[PDB]
Design a protein around this ligand. Structure first.
Ligand SMILES: [Zn+2]
Ligand SMILES: [Zn+2]
Ligand SMILES: [Zn+2]
Lengths: 119, 391, 387
């Protein structure tokens, strides 16, 4: 059937680099000092129309975590991962956030939303 | 006893109102009873109230109820309990149309139940004529030329033209002349557009189209652009019967109304979850909504309140459409992702029927506007099933 | 001119009078109405069925209908009064020294267990006739206080947990008031929830640090799960599934035997606590900074949102109750007890009498007129019908 695609709105939008379906915007950004597999990676707050696979435990630069792989809802291409559990207490601020690889997303300019007249 | 005395007194009071007096006098003379404490004086018209309550309870449990004669308190037989005839309920498949060579995406009727339009992923639209004396569907003509498939079909008020759209990121739409079977205009403004929703003006000479990239146009028959709006990512559109009001649902979970003549906008609905599709009733008073990861909702367009929430349907990954239907619009029909069709009555939230027989997803469901015993369901396996009364 | 509707009622009245034990006025009525024998043989006892249907309709609309046959007067509509609904304080229990954090009735509604902020759990026995509560047992040794209490399915054992960052739990037997094994796995654990197994021989415990265990009566560890920070637990009736609410604002079902997990509820605000109806189909849950929400687990759909309770940060517990679980009771931070009927989102009562915040409310399962309320002022209130 026709896959339902959401929209988050705003300015400075991010999109999947393969099919150009929006994922998030600049507003929901936390830290850009992250490293993935293809280079630098970004940590966001909320990402729309993603997919999730299964819980896997692995060792990273800061302790041991359990994560899930994420992928585009329209083209089925891997974009990053999402945290579920973090063993190190200090590393709990990223418990439910999403990392996307900067080489797999594209930035675009989106117009400001028309502000309702509240009528 | 005492319950017998109450019945005797109430029967006497009721009989005294039908012009009988000797019978009442002899009944009060042989039983021994007699007619603001209830012993001092009896309430007025109590037996009639009890009988009306009994008839109302009989109507409440009527499963397939018809509400046309719900305003007539009298004129219902008391000798036998009331039950409607489900003989005309469409709960048995009787025809399987399999001529699309790919998965089917949309189905619609022709505003009078004479023709049925089907649109599928194999880049074609098929029209089926309905035989009036048999209720049998036969192919009439095929319309080809689409590229990415057909996802939304809109009928003209006089059923002389129709408009076919495409899926996401399709920047053109087709307008077909249905009498001669030829193409009139294929409209496209810019290569970066996206037109996924279309609706017709009640006068049948203009139509409003829109998409999720910020495009919201009102156009003529020849494809000429007439009006434009900026700053809205529309998903579903509908034109009100006054001729100068367009209801549009956006990505902020709103169903706001707009006026192109004087450039005005209002606030109507506000949902807690994303909205896929909606349809308004015949008199433009109620709205039926398909909500992501939730059920099917009903809203009042004047009081601006939620009326009921219907459960049992699964959705959220695919786009699914529903419809009003039945005699005087008493039933609600919808598809789902679990390979079956759900039917609800307006009086209850739980489903009445769960019709199975499809092997893959059910995307759209269409009721016949003028034949209340005809439904069509298009599935995600290449089939269109026609449902009618059981044998 | 008597129309068709009149004739049917006339024949019904004639049949009823003839069958009642009278034989004169029926003949006199026929001799004047002039109509008598489907129009051949009337159904037997039509008026009785019609009047019973009317009485059933009258009973359907009754609001404060907590009640558990031609005994109803036909001259006036039937209404259950509010003074019979439990809305008036009947007992004030003042035996705890510091505070009260949790109160719970037994599964057969014979005893009440209240856990205080100081080191005490108190058991009250309910008289069956006069419905009065009397202390019978006191249990001591909970160094950090008691915040959660769970009853065995046959009301022979109860498990009492502590507050946050407490690495122990206690297991008593009610019959003799003695102490079974005091379970403690790791010195740096935190156990704050517990749920029993319908066979009554195993339980499941968990905590915020990431502990999720299934253990036996002797205290041994049978199973453990890693990667979840549970907040509230409940074992289903089938004896395999455990429903747990996590810190990701969702409820998930877990299967220890096959080691599987699925999703059921996804919300947008923290879930402080939840409870599940008797048939295991509906979940009533408390949402932080919002009201009380009802969820259908089989269909996974939010049904109703009840408004009126203030709850910002603290944990507040609500409950089902009524004649057939048609009523919802809850506490709130504004010193009041709230009661709703399932058909509307507006409260049908707003009780009062507590000095400080109320944080536990319970309904008697076997006596649908007794409510227990526990608050931070050091007293417990037993609510019943008006005198
Ligand atoms: Zn993609
Ligand atoms: Zn009916
Ligand atoms: Zn009652």
């Amino acid at each position: 059937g026709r896959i339902f695609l959401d929209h988050i709105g705003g300015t400075r939008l991010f999109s999947c680099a393969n099919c150009d379906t929006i994922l998030t915007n600049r507003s929901e950004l936390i830290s850009t000092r992250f490293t993935g597999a293809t280079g630098r990676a970004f940590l966001f707050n909320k990402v729309v129309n993603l997919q999730y696979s299964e819980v896997q435990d692995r060792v990273m630069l800061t302790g041991r975590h359990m994560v899930r792989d994420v992928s585009c809802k329209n083209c089925n291409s891997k974009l990053g991962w999402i945290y579920e559990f973090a063993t190190e207490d200090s590393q709990r601020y990223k418990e439910g956030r999403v990392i996307l690889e900067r080489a797999l997303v594209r930035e675009s300019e989106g117009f400001e939303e028309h502000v309702p007249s509240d009528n | 006893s005492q319950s017998d005395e109450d019945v005797i007194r109430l029967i006497g009071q009721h009989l005294n109102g039908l012009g009988l007096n000797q019978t009442v006098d002899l009944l009060m003379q042989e039983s021994g009873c007699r007619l603001l404490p209830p012993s001092v004086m009896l309430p007025p018209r109590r037996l009639q109230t009890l009988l009306r309550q009994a008839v109302e309870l009989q109507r409440d449990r009527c499963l397939y109820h018809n509400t046309k004669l719900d305003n007539n308190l009298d004129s219902v037989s008391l000798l036998i309990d009331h039950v409607c005839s489900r003989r005309q309920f469409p709960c048995y498949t009787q025809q399987i149309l399999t001529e699309h060579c790919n998965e089917v995406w949309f189905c619609k009727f022709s505003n009078d139940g004479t023709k049925l339009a089907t649109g599928s992923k194999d880049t074609t639209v098929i029209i089926w004529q309905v035989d009036p004396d048999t209720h049998l569907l036969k192919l009439l003509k095929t319309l080809e030329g689409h590229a990415y498939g057909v996802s939304y079909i809109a009928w003209s008020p006089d059923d002389n033209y129709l408009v076919a759209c495409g899926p996401d990121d399709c920047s053109e739409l087709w307008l077909w002349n249905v009498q001669t079977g030829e193409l009139r205009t294929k409209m496209s403004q810019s290569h970066e557009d996206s037109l996924t929703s279309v609706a017709w003006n009640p006068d049948g000479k203009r139509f409003v189209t829109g998409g999720q990239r910020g495009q919201f146009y009102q156009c003529d028959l020849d494809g000429n652009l007439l009006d434009s709006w900026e700053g809205v990512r529309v998903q579903c559109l509908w034109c009100l019967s006054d001729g100068k009001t367009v209801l549009a649902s956006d990505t902020h979970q709103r169903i706001r109304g707009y006026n192109f003549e004087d450039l005005t906008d209002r606030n109507i609905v506000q949902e807690d979850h994303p909205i896929m599709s909606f349809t308004i009733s015949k008199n433009g008073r109620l709205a039926l909504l398909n909500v992501a990861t939730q059920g099917v909702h009903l809203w009042d367009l004047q009081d601006r309140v939620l009326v009921r929430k219907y459960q049992g349907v699964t959705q959220g990954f695919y786009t699914i459409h529903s419809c009003f239907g039945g005699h005087n619009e008493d039933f609600i029909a919808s598809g789902s992702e679990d390979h079956k069709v759900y039917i609800w009555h307006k009086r209850s939230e739980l489903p009445i029927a769960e019709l199975t027989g499809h092997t893959r997803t059910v995307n759209c469901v269409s009721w016949n506007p003028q034949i209340p015993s005809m439904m069509a369901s298009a599935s995600d396996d290449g089939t269109v099933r026609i449902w009618g009364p059981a044998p």
